[PDB]
Design a protein around this ligand. Structure first.
Ligand SMILES: [Zn+2]
Ligand SMILES: [Zn+2]
Length: 198
């Protein structure tokens, strides 16, 4: 059949897992995470904090990669990409190729990959140990297209897969979370958690 990027949780030797801010569901929130759904709700192009927690520190040369896949089997082989409309947005970023859905902000060492063999997009930064006074490292992602964009995800659910890898790309750890990009993430989180209850 067709191999797809794995989404299996794997903490690895460093005890790698993800954390998310406790941001609430008010109308004004821009990024919010549901532990009931393991799902991030966030606004187009806004900052999405993703914490990296480890029990011990990965070595220099370790990198952290992010890639989106469609959640549903019948769409899983389709590369997740930004819609043609959003490709044309004007911003201060001088690094991300216009087709990439996921960007990293605030990191001058970011690299973007358009895999020559799988065609998948990903965004990768060097792993760094927590800043002074912090217990975790955070990476700040932006999602550059809405769930609703007809020329992109077109309402199909996606997951983001975060991989910890060595300098050669070998697996050191993996986690994932669903993400819904939308104008009203607090309202959407509230709706979906209410659906879940029912
Ligand atoms: Zn625009
Ligand atoms: Zn779009």
């Amino acid at each position: 059949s067709s191999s797809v990027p794995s989404q299996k949780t794997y903490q690895g030797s460093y005890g790698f897992r993800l954390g998310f801010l406790h941001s609430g569901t008010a109308k004004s929130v821009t990024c919010t995470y549901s532990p009931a759904l393991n799902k991030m709700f966030c606004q187009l192009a806004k900052t999405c904090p993703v914490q990296l927690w480890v029990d011990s520190t990965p070595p220099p040369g370790t990198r952290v990669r992010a890639m989106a896949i469609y959640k549903q089997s019948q769409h899983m082989t389709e590369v997740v990409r930004r819609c043609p409309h959003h490709e044309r947005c004007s911003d201060s970023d001088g690094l991300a190729p216009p087709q990439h859905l996921i960007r990293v902000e605030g990191n001058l060492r970011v690299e973007y990959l358009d895999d020559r063999n799988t065609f998948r997009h990903s965004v990768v930064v060097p792993y760094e140990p927590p800043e002074v006074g912090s217990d975790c490292t955070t990476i700040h992602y932006n999602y550059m297209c809405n769930s609703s964009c007809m020329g992109g995800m077109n309402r199909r659910p996606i997951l983001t897969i975060i991989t910890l890898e060595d300098s050669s790309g070998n697996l050191l750890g993996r986690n994932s979370f669903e993400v819904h990009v939308c104008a009203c993430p607090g309202r959407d989180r509230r709706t979906e958690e209410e659906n879940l209850r029912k």
